[PDB]
Coordinates of C-alpha atoms and ligand atoms in Angstrom, one line a residue:
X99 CA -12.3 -0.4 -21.1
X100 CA -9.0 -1.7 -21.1
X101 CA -6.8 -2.4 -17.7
X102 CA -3.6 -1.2 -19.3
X103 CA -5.5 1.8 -21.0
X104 CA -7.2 2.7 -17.7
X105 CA -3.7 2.4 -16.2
X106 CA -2.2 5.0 -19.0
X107 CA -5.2 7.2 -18.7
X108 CA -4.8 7.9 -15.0
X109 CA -1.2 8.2 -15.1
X110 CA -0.9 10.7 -17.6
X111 CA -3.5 12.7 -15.9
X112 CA -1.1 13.0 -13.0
X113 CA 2.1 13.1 -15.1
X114 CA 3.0 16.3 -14.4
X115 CA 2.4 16.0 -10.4
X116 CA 4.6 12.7 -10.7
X117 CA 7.2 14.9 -12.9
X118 CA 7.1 17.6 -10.5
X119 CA 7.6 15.7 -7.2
X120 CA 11.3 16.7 -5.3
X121 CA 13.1 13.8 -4.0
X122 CA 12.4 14.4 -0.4
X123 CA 8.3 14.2 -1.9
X124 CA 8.9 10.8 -3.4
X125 CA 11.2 9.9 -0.5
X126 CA 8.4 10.7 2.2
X127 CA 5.9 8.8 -0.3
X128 CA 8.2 5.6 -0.5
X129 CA 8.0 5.8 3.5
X130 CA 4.3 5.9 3.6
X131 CA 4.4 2.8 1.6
X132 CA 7.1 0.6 3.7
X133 CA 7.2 1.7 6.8
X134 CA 10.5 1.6 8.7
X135 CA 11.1 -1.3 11.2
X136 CA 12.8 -1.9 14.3
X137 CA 16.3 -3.4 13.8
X138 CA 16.2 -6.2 15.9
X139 CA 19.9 -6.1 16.1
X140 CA 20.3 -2.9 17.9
X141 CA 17.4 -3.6 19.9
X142 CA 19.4 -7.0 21.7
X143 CA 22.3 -5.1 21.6
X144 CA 20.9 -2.8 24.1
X145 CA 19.6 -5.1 26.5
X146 CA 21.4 -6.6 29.4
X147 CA 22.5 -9.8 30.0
X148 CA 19.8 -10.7 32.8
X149 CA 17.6 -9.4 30.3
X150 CA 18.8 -11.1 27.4
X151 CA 18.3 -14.3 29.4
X152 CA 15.1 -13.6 30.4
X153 CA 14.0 -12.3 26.8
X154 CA 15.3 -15.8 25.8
X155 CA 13.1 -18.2 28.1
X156 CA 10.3 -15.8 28.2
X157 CA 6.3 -17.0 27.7
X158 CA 5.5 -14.3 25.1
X159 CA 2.0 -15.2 24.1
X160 CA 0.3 -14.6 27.5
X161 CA 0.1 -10.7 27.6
X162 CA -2.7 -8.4 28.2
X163 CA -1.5 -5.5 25.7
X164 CA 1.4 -7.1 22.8
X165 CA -0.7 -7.2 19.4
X166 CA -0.5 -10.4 17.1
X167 CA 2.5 -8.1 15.6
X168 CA 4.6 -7.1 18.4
X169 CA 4.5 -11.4 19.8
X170 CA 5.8 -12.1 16.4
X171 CA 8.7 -9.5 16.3
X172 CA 9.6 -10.7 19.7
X173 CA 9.5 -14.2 18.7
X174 CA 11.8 -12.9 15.6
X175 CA 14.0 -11.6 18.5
X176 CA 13.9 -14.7 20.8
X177 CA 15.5 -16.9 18.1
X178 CA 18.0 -14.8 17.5
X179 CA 19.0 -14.8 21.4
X180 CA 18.6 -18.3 21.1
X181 CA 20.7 -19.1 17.9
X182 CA 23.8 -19.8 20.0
X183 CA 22.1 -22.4 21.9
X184 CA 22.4 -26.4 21.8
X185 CA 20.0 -27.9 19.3
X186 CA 18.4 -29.8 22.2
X187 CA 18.2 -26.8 24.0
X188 CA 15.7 -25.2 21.6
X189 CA 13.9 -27.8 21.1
X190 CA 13.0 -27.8 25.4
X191 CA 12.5 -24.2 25.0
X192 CA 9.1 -24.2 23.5
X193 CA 7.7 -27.3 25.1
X194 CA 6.7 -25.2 28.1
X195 CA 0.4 -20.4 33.6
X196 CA -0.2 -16.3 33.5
X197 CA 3.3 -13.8 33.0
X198 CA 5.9 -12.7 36.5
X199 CA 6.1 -9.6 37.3
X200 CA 9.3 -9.0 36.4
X201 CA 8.2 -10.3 33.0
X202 CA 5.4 -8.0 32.6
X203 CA 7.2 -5.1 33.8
X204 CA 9.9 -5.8 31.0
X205 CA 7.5 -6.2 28.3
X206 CA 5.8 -2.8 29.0
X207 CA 9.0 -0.8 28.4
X208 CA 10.2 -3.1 25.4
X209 CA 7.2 -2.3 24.0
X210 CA 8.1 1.3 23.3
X211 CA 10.9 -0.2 21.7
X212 CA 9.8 -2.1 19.3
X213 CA 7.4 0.5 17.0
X214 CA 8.1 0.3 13.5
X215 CA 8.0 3.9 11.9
X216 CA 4.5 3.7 10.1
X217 CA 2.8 6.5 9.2
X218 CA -0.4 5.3 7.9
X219 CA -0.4 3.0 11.4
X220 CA 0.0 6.1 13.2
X221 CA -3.1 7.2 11.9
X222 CA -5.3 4.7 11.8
X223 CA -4.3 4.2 15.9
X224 CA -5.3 7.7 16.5
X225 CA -8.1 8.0 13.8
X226 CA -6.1 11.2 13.1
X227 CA -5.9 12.5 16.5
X228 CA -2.3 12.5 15.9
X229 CA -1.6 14.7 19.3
X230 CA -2.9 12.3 21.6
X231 CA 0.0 11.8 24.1
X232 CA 0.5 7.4 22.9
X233 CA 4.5 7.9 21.9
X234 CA 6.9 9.6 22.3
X235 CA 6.3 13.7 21.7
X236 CA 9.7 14.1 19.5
X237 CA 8.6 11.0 17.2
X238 CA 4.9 12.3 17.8
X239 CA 6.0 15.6 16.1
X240 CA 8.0 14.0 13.4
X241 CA 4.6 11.8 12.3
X242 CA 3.2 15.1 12.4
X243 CA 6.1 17.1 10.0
X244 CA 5.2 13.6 7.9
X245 CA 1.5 13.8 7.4
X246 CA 1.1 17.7 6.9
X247 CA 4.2 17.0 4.1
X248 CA 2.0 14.7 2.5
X249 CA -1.1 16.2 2.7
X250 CA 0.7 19.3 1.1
X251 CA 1.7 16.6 -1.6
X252 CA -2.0 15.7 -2.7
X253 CA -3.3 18.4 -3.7
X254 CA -4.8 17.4 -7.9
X255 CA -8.5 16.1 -7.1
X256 CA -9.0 13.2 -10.0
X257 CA -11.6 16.0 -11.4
X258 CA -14.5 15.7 -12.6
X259 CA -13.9 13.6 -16.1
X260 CA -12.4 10.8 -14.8
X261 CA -14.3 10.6 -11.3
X262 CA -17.6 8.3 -13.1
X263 CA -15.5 6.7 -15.6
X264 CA -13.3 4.8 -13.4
X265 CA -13.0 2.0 -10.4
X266 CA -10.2 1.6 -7.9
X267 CA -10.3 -1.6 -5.7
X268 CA -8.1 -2.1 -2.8
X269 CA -8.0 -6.0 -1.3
X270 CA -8.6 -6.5 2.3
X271 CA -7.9 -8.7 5.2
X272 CA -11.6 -9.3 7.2
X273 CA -9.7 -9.1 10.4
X274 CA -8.5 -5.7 9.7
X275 CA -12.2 -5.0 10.0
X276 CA -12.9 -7.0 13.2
X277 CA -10.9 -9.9 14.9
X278 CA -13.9 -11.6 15.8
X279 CA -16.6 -12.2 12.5
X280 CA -13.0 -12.8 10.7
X281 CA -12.5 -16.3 11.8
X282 CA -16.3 -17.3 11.2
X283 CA -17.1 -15.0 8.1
X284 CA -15.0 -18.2 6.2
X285 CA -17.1 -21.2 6.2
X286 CA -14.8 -23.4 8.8
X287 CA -16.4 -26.6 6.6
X288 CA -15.3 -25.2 2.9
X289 CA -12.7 -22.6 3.2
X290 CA -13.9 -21.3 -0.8
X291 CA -16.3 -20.3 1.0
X292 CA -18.4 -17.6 2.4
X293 CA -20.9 -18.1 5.6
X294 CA -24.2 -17.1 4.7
X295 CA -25.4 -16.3 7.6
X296 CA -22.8 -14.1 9.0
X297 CA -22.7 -12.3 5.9
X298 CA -25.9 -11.3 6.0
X299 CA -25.1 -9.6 9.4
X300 CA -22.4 -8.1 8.5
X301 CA -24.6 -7.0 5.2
X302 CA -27.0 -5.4 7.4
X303 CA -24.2 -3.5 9.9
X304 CA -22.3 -1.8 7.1
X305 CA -23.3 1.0 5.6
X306 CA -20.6 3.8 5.8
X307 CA -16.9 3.6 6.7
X308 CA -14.7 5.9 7.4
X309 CA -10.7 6.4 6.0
X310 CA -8.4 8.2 8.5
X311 CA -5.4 7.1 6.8
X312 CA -4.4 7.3 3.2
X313 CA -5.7 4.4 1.7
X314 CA -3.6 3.1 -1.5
X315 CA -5.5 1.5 -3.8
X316 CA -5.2 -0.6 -7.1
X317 CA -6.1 0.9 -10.6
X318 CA -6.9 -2.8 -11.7
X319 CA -8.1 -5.6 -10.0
X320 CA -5.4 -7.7 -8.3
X321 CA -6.0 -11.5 -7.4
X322 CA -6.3 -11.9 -3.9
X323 CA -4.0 -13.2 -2.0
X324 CA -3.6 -15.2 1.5
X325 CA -6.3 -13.7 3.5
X326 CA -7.7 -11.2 1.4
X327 CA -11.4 -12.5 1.2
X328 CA -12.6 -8.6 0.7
X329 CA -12.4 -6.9 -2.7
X330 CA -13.6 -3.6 -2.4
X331 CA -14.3 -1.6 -5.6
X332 CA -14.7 2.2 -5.1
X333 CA -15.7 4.8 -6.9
X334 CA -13.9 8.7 -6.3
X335 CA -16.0 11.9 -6.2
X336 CA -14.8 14.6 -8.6
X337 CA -12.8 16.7 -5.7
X338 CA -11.3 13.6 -4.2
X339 CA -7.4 14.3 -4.0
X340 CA -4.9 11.3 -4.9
X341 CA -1.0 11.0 -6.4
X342 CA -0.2 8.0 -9.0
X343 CA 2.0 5.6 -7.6
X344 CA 4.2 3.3 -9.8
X345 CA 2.8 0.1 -10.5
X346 CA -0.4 1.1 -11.1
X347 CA -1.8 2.5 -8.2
X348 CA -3.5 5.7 -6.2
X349 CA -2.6 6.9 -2.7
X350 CA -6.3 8.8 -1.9
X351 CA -5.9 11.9 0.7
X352 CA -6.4 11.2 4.3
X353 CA -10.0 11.6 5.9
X354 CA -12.1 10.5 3.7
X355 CA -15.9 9.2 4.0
X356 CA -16.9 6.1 1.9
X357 CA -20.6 4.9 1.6
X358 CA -21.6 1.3 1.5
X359 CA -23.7 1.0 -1.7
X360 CA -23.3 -2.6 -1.9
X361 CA -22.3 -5.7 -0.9
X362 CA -22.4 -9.0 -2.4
X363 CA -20.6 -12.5 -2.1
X364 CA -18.9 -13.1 -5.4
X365 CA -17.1 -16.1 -7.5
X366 CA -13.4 -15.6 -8.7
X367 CA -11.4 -18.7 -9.5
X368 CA -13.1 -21.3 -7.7
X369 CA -13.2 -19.2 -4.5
X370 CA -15.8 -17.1 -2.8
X371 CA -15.4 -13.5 -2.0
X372 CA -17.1 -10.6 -0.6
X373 CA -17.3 -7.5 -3.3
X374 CA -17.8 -4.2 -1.7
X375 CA -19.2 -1.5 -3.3
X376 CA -18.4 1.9 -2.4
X377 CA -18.7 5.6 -3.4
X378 CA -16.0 8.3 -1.9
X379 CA -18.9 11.1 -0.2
X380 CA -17.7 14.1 2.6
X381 CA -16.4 12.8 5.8
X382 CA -18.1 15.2 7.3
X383 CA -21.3 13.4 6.2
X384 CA -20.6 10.6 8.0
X385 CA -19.4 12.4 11.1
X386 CA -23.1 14.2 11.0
X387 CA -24.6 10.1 11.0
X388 CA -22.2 9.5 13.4
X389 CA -23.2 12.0 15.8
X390 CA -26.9 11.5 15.4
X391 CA -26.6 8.1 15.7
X392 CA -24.8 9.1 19.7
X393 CA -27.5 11.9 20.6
X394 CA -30.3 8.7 19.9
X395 CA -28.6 6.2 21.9
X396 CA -28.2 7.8 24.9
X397 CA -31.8 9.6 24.7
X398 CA -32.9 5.9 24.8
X399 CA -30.8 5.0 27.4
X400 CA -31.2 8.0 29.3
X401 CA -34.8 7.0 29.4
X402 CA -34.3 3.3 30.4
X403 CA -32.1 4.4 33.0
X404 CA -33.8 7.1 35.1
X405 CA -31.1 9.6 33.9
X406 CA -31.3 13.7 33.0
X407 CA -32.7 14.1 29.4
X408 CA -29.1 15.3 28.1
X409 CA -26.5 12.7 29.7
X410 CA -23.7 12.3 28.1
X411 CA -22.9 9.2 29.0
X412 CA -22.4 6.9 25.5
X413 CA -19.3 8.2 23.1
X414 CA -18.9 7.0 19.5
X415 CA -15.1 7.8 19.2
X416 CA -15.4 6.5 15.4
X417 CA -12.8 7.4 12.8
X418 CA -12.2 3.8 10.6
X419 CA -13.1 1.4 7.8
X420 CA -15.4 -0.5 10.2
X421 CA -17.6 2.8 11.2
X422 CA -21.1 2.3 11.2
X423 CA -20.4 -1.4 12.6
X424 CA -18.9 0.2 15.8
X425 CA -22.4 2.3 15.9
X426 CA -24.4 -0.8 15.2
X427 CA -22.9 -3.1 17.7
X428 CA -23.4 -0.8 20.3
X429 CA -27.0 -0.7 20.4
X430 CA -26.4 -4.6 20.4
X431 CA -24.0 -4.5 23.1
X432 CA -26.1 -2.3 25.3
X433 CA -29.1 -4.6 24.9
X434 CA -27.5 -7.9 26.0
X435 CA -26.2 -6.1 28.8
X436 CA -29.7 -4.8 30.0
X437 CA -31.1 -8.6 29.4
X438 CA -28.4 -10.3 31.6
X439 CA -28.1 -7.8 34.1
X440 CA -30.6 -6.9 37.1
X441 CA -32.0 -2.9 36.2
X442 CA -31.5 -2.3 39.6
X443 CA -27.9 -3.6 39.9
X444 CA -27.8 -1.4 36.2
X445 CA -29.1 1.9 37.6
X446 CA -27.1 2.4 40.7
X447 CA -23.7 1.9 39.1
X448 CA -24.7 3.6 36.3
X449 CA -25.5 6.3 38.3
X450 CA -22.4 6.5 40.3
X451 CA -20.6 6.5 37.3
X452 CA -22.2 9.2 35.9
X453 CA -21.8 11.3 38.9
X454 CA -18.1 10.7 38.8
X455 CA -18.7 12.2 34.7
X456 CA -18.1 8.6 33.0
X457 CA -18.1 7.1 29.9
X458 CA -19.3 3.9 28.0
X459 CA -17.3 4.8 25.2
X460 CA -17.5 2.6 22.2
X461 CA -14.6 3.1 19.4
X462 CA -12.5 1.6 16.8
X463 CA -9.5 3.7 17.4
X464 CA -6.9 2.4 20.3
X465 CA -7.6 2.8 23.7
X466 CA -4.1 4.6 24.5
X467 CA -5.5 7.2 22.3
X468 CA -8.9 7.4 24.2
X469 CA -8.8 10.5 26.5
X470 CA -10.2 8.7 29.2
X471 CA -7.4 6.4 29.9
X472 CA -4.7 8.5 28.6
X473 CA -5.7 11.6 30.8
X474 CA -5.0 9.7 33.8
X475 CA -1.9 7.8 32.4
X476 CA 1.1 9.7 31.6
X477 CA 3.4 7.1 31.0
X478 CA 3.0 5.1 27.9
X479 CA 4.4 1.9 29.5
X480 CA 1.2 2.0 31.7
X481 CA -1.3 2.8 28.7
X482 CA -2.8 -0.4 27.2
X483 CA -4.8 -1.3 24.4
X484 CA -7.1 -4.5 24.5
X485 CA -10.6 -5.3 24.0
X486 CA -11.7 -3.7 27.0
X487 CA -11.4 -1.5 29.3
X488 CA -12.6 0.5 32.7
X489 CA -11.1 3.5 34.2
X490 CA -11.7 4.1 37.6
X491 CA -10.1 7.7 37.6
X492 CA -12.4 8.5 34.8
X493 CA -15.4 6.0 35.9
X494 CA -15.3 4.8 31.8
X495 CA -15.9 1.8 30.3
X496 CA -13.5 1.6 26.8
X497 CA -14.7 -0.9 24.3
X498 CA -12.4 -1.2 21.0
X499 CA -14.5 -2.7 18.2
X500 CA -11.8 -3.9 15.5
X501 CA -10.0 -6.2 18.2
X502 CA -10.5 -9.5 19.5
X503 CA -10.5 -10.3 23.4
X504 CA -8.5 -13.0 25.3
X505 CA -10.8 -16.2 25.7
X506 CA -13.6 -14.3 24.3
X507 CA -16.9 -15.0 22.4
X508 CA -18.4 -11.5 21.6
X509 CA -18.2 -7.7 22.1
X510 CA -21.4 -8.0 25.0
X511 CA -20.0 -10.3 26.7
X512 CA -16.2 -8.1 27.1
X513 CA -18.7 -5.1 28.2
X514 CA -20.3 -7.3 31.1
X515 CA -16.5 -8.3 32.0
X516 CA -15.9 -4.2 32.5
X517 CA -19.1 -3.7 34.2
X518 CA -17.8 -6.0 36.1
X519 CA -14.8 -3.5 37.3
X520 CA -17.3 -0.6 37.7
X521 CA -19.4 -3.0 40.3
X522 CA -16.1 -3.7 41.8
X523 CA -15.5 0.1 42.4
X524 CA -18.6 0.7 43.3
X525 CA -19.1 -1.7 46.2
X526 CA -15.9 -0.8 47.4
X527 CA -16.5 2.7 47.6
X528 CA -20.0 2.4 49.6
X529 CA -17.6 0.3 52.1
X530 CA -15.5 3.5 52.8
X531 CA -16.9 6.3 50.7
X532 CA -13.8 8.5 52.6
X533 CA -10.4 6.3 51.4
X534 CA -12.9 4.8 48.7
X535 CA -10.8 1.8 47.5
X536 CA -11.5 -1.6 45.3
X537 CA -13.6 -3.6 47.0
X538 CA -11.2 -6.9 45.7
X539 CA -8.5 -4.9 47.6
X540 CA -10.6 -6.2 51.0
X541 CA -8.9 -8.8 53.3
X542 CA -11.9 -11.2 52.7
X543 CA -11.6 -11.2 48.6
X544 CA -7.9 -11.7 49.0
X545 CA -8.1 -14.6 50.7
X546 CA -11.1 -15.9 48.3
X547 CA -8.7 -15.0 45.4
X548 CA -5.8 -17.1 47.3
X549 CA -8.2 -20.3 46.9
X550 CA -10.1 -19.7 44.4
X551 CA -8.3 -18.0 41.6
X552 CA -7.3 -20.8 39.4
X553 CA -10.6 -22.4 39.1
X554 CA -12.4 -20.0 36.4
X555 CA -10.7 -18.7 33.1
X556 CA -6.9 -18.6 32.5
X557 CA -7.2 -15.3 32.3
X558 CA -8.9 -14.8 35.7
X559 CA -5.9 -16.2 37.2
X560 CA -3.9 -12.3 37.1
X561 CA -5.4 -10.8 39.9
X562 CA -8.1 -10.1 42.2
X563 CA -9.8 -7.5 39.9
X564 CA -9.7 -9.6 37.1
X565 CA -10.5 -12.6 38.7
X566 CA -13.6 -10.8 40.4
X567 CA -14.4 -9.5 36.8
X568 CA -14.5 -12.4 34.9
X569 CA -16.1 -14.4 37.8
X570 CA -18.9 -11.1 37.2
X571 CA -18.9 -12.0 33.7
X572 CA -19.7 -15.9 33.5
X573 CA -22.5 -15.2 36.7
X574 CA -24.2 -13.5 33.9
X575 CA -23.7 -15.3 30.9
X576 CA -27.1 -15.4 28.4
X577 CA -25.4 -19.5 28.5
X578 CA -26.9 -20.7 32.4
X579 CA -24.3 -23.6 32.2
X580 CA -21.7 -20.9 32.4
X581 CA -23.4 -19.1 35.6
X582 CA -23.6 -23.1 37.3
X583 CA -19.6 -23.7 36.9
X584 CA -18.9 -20.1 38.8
X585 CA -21.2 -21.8 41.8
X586 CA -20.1 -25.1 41.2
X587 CA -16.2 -24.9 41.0
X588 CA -15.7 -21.5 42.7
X589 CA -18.6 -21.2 45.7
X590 CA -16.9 -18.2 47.4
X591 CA -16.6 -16.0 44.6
X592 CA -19.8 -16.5 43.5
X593 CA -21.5 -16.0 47.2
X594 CA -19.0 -12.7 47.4
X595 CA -20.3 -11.7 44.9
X596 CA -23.6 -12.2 45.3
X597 CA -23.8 -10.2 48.7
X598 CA -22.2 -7.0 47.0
X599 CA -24.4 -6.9 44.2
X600 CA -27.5 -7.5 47.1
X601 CA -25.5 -4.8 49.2
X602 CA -25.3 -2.3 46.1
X603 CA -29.1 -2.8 45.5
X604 CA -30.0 -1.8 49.0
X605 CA -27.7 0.9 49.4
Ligands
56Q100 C1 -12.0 -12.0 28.9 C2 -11.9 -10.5 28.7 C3 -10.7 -9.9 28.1 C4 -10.7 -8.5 27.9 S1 -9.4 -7.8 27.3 O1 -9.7 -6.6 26.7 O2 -8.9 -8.7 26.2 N1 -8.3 -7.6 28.5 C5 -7.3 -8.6 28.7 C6 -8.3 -6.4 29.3 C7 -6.9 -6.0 29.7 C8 -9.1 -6.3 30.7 O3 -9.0 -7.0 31.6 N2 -10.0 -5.3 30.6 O4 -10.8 -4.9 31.7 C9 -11.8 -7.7 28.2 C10 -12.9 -8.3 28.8 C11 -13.0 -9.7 29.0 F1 -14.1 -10.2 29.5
ZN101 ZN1 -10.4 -6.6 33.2

């Protein structure tokens, strides 16, 4: 019809609820909206001077666990320090290797510092799993007080005359679905627009989707704006429950299922952009293709791997807009790793991982809030979320779809990195299956590391695990002028190497 009549329609048909809302209701809805932040203020006031001054000179990029986010608010809080400085001074200060430890080890308790109040964050993080142990229990309990208040609050389902007659749209950054295809979904040639080939892949990978937050949408259209290059346009079932919000929009109730009906690349004012069609079904539909989808990929790899018929060895912890990507990708992931890895090298790690009741566990919520780090890490200063992961307490491999990895090209290659780790702990424990340690912790890959640790990636450069790791991961790159530079620039490593995966084999 109309935009403004549309607008009208929906608004009187939730007059009432909006009339009927107490202030603490419209106060917890205003919340949901704009989340509280951190005063930086009060943050710098309680730091000390030492670390004041090493907050001020500090190399904030180079961390293994501060998102885009968190580096910018620090950077917002650097300046400040450093707004008292000489003019010259400032300018030095940014003209200038890996993080100290005294650096790291003061970033991992700012960190909990820092955490805007954010409900729909909150969510999202823990794809609802609001209990898992990621902040602070007394905040922990006060999201929860929040979400239950405002599940309470939406309780009118847009009903079953309005439901067919009406779209809601809601504009999205790409990278809020993954990091990665983000940066190469744009055509880097003509930024209006859209790479064809990519978006056929990511045509063919998206099929259902999953809200664990409360999504707020738009009644009308709105222009995109920087970084929005995804204009979804939805249509509600008859029971879905939602609230008007003023300026014309909807906040949906949380958990949600949405399937992809289409997905096309459209024209809007001289720019390209990608219209996604999708219809509001039960989330519990979704969870059924979700599960499915987990019981067939490890009966496939069960039977490729010499395992019991019922391993459980592959997890989909799945619970966001991204879904049946995550699912997708991990068939993907598993096959690249079975291509660049020996099947013997494969099946005795495997197995050792499964005897210690591992995980690959492949998930779009973060890996704080994945039971198989967080059961074996207490305090939230150690928990990290990255790309990657592997858990020796748990013998898991964590492998976070939605982010993008330091230095890296693609999701397999991140898995190889932590496959890496497992080989790692695996060697090391045939070595002394009584104290059963790391075999990078030896004397002999110490003193390798001592020589030969800045000569692969940046990133290798943090420690002997890491440096093992990533030495593990360009030996087996699908790229065989990656696998030459380890031999070439790092002969050691690689011939270490070598011998434990020779002396796993024959074990
Ligand atoms: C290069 C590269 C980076 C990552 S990561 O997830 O970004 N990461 C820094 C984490 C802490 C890590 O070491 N996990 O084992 C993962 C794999 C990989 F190959
Ligand atoms: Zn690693």
């Amino acid at each position: 019809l109309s935009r403004y009549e549309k607008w009208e329609k929906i608004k009187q048909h939730y007059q009432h609820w909006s009339d009927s809302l107490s202030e603490e209701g419209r106060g917890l809805l205003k919340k949901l909206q704009i989340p509280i932040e951190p005063k930086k203020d009060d943050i710098i006031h309680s730091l000390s001077q030492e670390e004041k001054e090493l907050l001020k000179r500090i190399q904030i990029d180079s961390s293994d666990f501060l998102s885009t986010e968190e580096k910018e608010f620090l950077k917002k809080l650097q300046i400040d320090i450093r707004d008292s400085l000489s003019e010259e001074e400032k300018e030095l200060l940014n003209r200038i290797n890996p993080l100290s430890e005294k650096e790291k080890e003061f970033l991992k308790k700012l960190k909990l510092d820092i955490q805007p109040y954010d409900i729909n964050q909150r969510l999202q993080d823990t794809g609802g799993l609001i209990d898992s142990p990621s902040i602070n229990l007394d905040v922990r309990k006060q999201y929860k007080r929040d979400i239950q208040n405002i599940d309470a609050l939406l309780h009118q389902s847009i009903g079953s005359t309005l439901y067919n007659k009406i779209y809601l749209y809601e504009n999205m950054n790409i990278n809020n679905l993954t990091a990665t295809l983000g940066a190469d979904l744009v055509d880097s040639t003509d930024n209006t627009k859209i790479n064809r080939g990519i978006f056929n892949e990511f045509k063919k990978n998206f099929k259902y989707s999953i809200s664990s937050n409360y999504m707020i949408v738009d009644i009308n259209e709105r222009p995109a704006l920087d970084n929005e290059r995804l204009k979804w346009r939805i249509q509600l079932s008859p029971d879905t429950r939602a609230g008007y919000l003023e300026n014309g929009k909807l906040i949906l109730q949380r958990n949600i299922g949405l399937e992809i009906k289409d997905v096309q690349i459209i024209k809007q004012s001289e720019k390209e952009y990608i219209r996604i069609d999708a219809k509001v079904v039960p989330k519990s539909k979704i969870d059924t293709k979700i599960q499915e989808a987990q019981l067939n990929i490890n009966q496939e790899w069960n039977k490729a791997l010499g395992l019991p018929k019922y391993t459980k060895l592959i997890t989909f912890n799945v619970h966001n807009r991204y879904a049946s990507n995550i699912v997708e990708s991990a068939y993907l992931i598993l096959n690249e790793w079975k291509n660049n890895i020996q099947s013997d090298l494969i099946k005795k790690v495997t197995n050792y991982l499964v005897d210690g009741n591992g995980r690959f566990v492949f998930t779009d919520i973060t890996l704080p809030n994945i039971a198989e780090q967080y059961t074996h890490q207490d305090e939230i200063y150690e928990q990290v979320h990255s790309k990657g992961l592997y858990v020796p307490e748990s013998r898991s491999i964590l492998l976070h779809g939605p982010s993008k990895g330091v230095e890296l090209r693609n999701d397999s290659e991140g898995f190889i990195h932590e496959f890496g780790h497992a080989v790692d702990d695996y060697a090391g424990y045939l070595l002394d299956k009584n104290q059963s340690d790391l075999v990078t912790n030896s004397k002999k890959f110490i003193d390798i590391f001592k020589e030969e640790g800045s000569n692969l990636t940046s990133y290798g450069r943090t420690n002997e695990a890491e440096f093992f790791a990533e030495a593990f991961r360009l030996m087996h790159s699908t790229d065989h002028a990656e696998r030459l530079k380890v031999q070439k620039n790092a002969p050691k490593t690689f011939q270490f190497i070598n011998d434990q995966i020779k002396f796993i084999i024959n074990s």
